[PDB]
Amino acid sequence: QVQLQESGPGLVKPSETLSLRCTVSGGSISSYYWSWFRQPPGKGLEWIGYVHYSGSTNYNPSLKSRFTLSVDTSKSQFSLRLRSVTAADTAIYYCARDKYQTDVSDIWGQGTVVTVSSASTKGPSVFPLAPSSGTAALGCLVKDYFPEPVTVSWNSGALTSGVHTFPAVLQSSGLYSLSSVVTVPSSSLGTQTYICNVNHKPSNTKVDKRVEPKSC
Amino acid sequence: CWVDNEEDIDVILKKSTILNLDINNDIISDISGFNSSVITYPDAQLVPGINGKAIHLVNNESSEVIVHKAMDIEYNDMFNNFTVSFWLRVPKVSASHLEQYDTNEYSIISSMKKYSLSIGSGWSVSLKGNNLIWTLKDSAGEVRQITFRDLSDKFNAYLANKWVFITITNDRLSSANLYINGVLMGSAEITGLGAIREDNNITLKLDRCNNNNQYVSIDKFRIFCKALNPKEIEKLYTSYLSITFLRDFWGNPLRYDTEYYLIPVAYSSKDVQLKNITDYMYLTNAPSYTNGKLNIYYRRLYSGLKFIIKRYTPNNIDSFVRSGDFIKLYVSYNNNEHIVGYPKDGNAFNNLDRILRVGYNAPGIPLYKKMEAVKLRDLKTYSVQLKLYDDKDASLGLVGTHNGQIGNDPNRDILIASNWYFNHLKDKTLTCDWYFVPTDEGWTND
Amino acid sequence: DIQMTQSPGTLSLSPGERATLSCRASQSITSSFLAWYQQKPGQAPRLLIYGASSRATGIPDRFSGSGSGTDFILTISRLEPEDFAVYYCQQYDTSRTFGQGTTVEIKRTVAAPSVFIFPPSDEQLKSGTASVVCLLNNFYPREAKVQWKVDNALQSGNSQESVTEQDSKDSTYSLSSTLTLSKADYEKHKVYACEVTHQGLSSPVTKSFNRG
After folding, report:
1. Which chain B residue is nearest to residue C91, measuring alpha carbons?
2. A216 in a domain, yes or no?
3. Do residue A111 and residue A155 come from a single domain?
4. Between B418 and which of B237, B373, B397, C20 could a Cys-Cys bridge form, CB atoms 3.0 to 4.6 Å apart?
């Protein structure tokens, strides 16, 4: 029942040094080899390196010695340090225990999200996606916020069928944007009120935007 | 041989060398360039060394080597710093010879004139039981000494039958410092000393040694007119190390057709055992010897399985095993030699670690036995790696161990061949490193 | 340095069917140090196979690995519902490198997208920017392309899209594409159109509005 838990800063500014820790529970560092991996959003897995209680380390050669791994058996922890972080270092970082006398990894942590950006914390603007001409689609455009995540739902829990909340995209400005849409009977557009309830906890923002058919 | 000490380290070492003994075509000579005459007496013997042959001195008046410092070279003189360096090999002193010769201090290398009544000025390397002693003595009779007290665990000790590299630096303004294999191992302040007027001869010979059976070996004896710093010492030590010839546990060249006990470097307290002919090998705890009164203990040697290295293609060549040689590995068991190898599709662990077998004999089953003896890591250690190949020149891995269980046998460290080691060759400790221990007159178990 | 190429990029299957995933290395892996991992969305990878053909502890017997040299195969004898995920091969012979992954997704009947276009809101045009949104709703298969046209001039570099996960009930995808302009650029033209091409559409479907 060995469990690994990553911990780090969620956000790091460019050119700073990123520091992450993995804490081993229900077990110890012992004589296992311990590895770090990362996975940039939408981009698949990359091995970073391993560390061992003896102090021995080894690294993915293509990472150009930017990473340093280390271990502290007394705290049953091992750690990662990454110098001069760039936006290309945004990723989920995973710690893992290598399998005995293999270089595969069979016990993994849940990962820790690391975002590296110079953007300041900013609440979203919420713009209506108004319905028009027997099913209609309407929605909310939640634009220009930082950092992730926002949460979106409709009509204070009463509307879940037909809702699609899309993954956010990062804009060239460095701020995120996403849309939430719902399809409904076109006959309900005259009588049913539709309100998208948006939450952005980083900035303590709540928005409840009524989405109304546009007149002419 | 003076120098600008802002120079490149290699240049510093080369041009500060006042004296440097080398053995070429069985003749001891000075290759420093200052051409000090060296006289080898009849019973000065030559033995295998770290590079070529070494000086071997036994306890009688004819076993000596004398260096007449060429006309006039000065390296001590007055307050001139100097360093001496040499490879040294001292047999493990038996418990018998310890408690009867523990107090007999005898020199092995010295620039002090030896008179029957007294010694007089100079420096000397001497041994006193399991102590290595460096003495400076000035013309007014003052003395300074480093006394290196060797550790009690003789498997890992420096005065216990392995070639070790000694370096002693003398800063007349501060301390004398003793290094072994580049590591600081002893020190004494020498500030009070006055003028050192040594003899014009340096004498390599056992002097005042009461034990008739005592001997030592010495190689690359060398003198610098500078107190070397740790970086220079480290470069000097590693300048002697090379992978060309593989080494046995004592530091001597590895040889074909010679019986070796195998010990894993990572579990040095273990021996290799055989489950059964045609079956696998595993590790067990070796027995030990302890004598607190004499300040010694060690795991006993020469227990466990004996191995023999043969050339894979007999090829007629000498008997030295060179790194990269293709070999066959045999176990000596019940007066017979049994091939070590891996049968095609033989038992293996789930990670593909291949379980080695001894004397496997199934007719019609290919047995992969081609090995490459190589030095892939840890140049300062007298260890070797063995790489096993199949019939198509594909690597089955380095010989190592896998902790596991076969059948209902106890859980064991089982000898395997594994490719895992190749991603890990810079790690501090690995189970693919082996010592090859031949029986030797310089080590008998008590 | 060893690269691995996985094929196919996407595998569309039903529960109960056999899944064969391929991995090809840029050099022979004579050690057979080839492993396979499973990753579901939002979770850490899970070791399935190592040494090319050994099952990891606890892995169901429907997972098997085979192959040698440069070509390696993961087989799932009969897909179960929990097996729809991304699969990565990993060589650990020379350092450690991964393939780019194969997605196993649920096959269903072709379903054309419903297409909606949304002109920018008035509250946004006050901000100085304009966002036009195109929604492609509940389609299968996942492959669909959106082209933005502003006065029939096809746009480049000013739009982003994202896609939902396959729906757990009807197994379709939805897609949202946002065309972003400056307010000044937006009032330069009149026709804004969203052209979608999808296997369920005999002819590309266009939705458009005239600014005003």
Report:
1. B423
2. no
3. no
4. B397
Q: What is the pairing mode between strands A11-12 and A112-116? A: parallel
Contact yes or no for C203/C128 (Cβ under 8 A): no
Domains of chain C and CATH, by start: 4-106 (2.60.40.10), 114-210 (2.60.40.10)
A100 domain-assigned: yes
CB-nearest partner of A103 from B353, B420, B429: B420
Domain boundary among A83, A116, A149: A116
Tell me whether residues C31 and B350 touch, CB distance under 8 A.
no
Question: What is the rounded CA–CA span in Å between residue B43 and residue B24?
Answer: 18
Range of the domain at A164: 125-211
- At the top level of CATH, the class of B9-240 is mainly beta
What's the CA gap between B44 and B24, in Å, rounded? Answer: 15
For C:79-108, CB contacts with B below 8 A are 92-96
CATH 2.80.10.50 intervals, chain B? 258-437
**The tokens 């099952």 sit on which residue?**
C55
How far is C21 from C102, CA to CA, in rounded Å? 7
C-chain residues near A135 (CB < 8 A): 114
Contact B427 A103 (CB under 8 A): no
Specify the resolution in Å: 2.0
Q: Does 2.80.10.50 match the CATH number of domain B258-437?
A: yes
| Structural domains counted in chain A | 2
- Measured in angstroms, the CA of B393 and the nearest CA of chain C are apart by 10
- What was the experiment behind these coordinates? X-ray
Tokens representing residue A153 in the block: 């739902």
Burial class from Cβ neighbours inside 10 Å (0-12, 13-18, 19+) for residue C165 reads exposed
> Which phi and psi (to 5°) does residue B260 adopt?
-130, 130
How many helices and strands, by DSSP H and E, does chain B display?
Answer: 3, 32
Q: How many CA atoms, within 13 angstroms, populate the side-chain half-sphere of residue A170?
A: 13
**φ/ψ of residue B257, rounded to 5:** 60, 35
Where residue A20 sits, what CATH number does that domain have?
2.60.40.10
Tell whether A112 and A130 lie within a shared domain.
no
How far is residue C135's CA from residue C161's CA, in Å, rounded to a whole number? 10
What residues does B367 pair with on adjacent strands?
A: B343
Torsion angle, CA of B340/B344/B349/B351, rounded to 10 degrees?
110
Structure tokens at B379: 């140049």
